[PDB]
Structure formats: structure tokens, C-alpha cells
Amino acid sequence: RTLFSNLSDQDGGAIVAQLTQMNIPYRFANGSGAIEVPADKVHELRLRLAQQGLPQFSEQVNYQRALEGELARTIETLGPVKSARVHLAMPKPSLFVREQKSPSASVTVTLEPGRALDEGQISAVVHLVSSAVAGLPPGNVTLVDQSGHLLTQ
């Protein structure tokens, strides 16, 4: 299954280097800028790579919803995470001409009783989400737990 698509050559190369180091089989889709990898490893690998910093309405909505769902699924592969919800809020093509807008994301996680996300895991989530959405800076990702505690500084 596709690990990543639409990668820069630089990111692609970095991702391939990491996969080789981890001894994970991979197949870079020919001229598809995509890297199909073991289906059962896709989510774990996305997270791991994120930790190392790598890399119509209905459709949009659907797309957005699909993206949200995928991101949630990936985040749920983290050990301490029981469930995750991702909400993406990219304003519709800035109607206002002068004012400038920017995409943001809100991530809510339900943690396993007695478990917490560490700083690394938190950073991985933030990176994963930011990288998935064009123009979404890490700073515009808010990560909260079930109790509403802000995890991202």
C-alpha cells in the first residue's frame, strides 16, 4: 500500500534511506512519486517517519473528511492512543481580497487509561498533520486530549 505519494525527490530519497535502514521492503511507484509499502506497516511507518521529520464541497468535504479519517487512523496506531479525531479547517478560497487566511487543524485524542503521550509522540502527530495539508504550519496544529488538555505548546 501507498506510504506516501507526491513526494519531492529529496523527501523521497530520505524516506527510502530510512526504509532501507529499518530493513522494510518498499516499491517506489514508477513516475507516480509514490512509495507502496507492506500494507500492515503503512501506518506505523508513517508515524515513525513523522517522528524523524519526514516528509466538490462534497468532494472537498469528502476529501477533507477522507483526509481527516486517514490522519486519525494513522494517529491511532500510537500505543497510548485509544482513539483520534482530526478536524481540518482550511477557509474556502479567501473571499476577502486583502485579508490573508491559513489552514489549521485540531486533533483530539482519547488516551488509554493511565497512559500519556510523550514529547516525541506529540511532535510526530503535529508533523504528520502539518505535512498532510498544504500550507498548514506546525504551529497551526492544536493537539488536545479527552479532558481538553492542550498537549501542543
Partner: peptide, 27 residues
């Protein structure tokens, strides 16, 4: 410039007060 920094400071304070209220009002 500085006004935007002050406004962001106010927004963060308001958001944290909101979250503190929500935390106890949730259970």
C-alpha cells in the same frame, strides 16, 4: 507589530481560561 503580539497574548489567556472552565464543567 506589537499590537498583534498583544492580541495573541490575550487570545492565549482567554483560551486557557476557557479550557480550565471546560475541564471542571465536563465531568
Amino acid at each position: 507589530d506589537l499590537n498583534d503580539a498583544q492580541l495573541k497574548f490575550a487570545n492565549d489567556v482567554e483560551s486557557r481560561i476557557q479550557r480550565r472552565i471546560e475541564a471542571i464543567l465536563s465531568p
